Amino acid sequence: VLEEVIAEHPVLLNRAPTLHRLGIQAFEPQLVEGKAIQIHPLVCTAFN
DNA sequence: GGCGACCCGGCGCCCGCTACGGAGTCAACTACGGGTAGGGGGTATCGGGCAACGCGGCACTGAACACCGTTGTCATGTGCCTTG
Numbered sequence: 001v002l003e004e005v006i007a008e009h010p011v012l013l014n015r016a017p018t019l020h021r022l023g024i025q026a027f028e029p030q031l032v033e034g035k036a037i038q039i040h041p042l043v044c045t046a047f048n
Numbered sequence: 049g050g051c052g053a054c055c056c057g058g059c060g061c062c063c064g065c066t067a068c069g070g071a072g073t074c075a076a077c078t079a080c081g082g083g084t085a086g087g088g089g090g091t092a093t094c095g096g097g098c099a100a101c102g103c104g105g106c107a108c109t110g111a112a113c114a115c116c117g118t119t120g121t122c123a124t125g126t127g128c129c130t131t132g
Contacts, residue, residue, distance in 0.1 A: 016065035 003031050013039070015047045022046040 010026040018024065025043060032038055 014065095017063070018065090019063085 006031065013037070013047075017048065019048065 006029045009029065011029050012024050012026050014024045025046070030038075
């Protein structure tokens with residue numbers, strides 16, 4: 001049910017310093033095993 | 049005697065979040081007096097447990113009439129035979 005419900009629902013990833021407005025960026029969530037957030041390498045450098 | 053430095057006070061702040069330890073500490077006293085509060089003791093008041101007894105449909109009570117149906121019944125009318 002969780003896999004069914006999360007889709008098409010944004011979540012705002014945000015890093016602590018949030019120096020500039022790209023510190024908060026919406027994303028499409030996606031269930032994944034493990035316990036660490038998977039993030040796209042391209043958007044990393046915007047978050048520093 | 050307002051300028052003047054200087055002096056001093058006095059104040060103002062001092063990136064972000066999660067997540068990440070515990071620790072807890074030194075010097076009066078008694079007497080009274082009330083009042084509240086507790087306890088048990090006893091008492092008026094409210095709440096819980098049962099068969100008749102309210103109902104109603106219908107049903108029986110058929111009893112007592114009613115509704116046709118029937119073969120009871122009668123006094124009174126045709127057809128043949130005997131006599132005018």
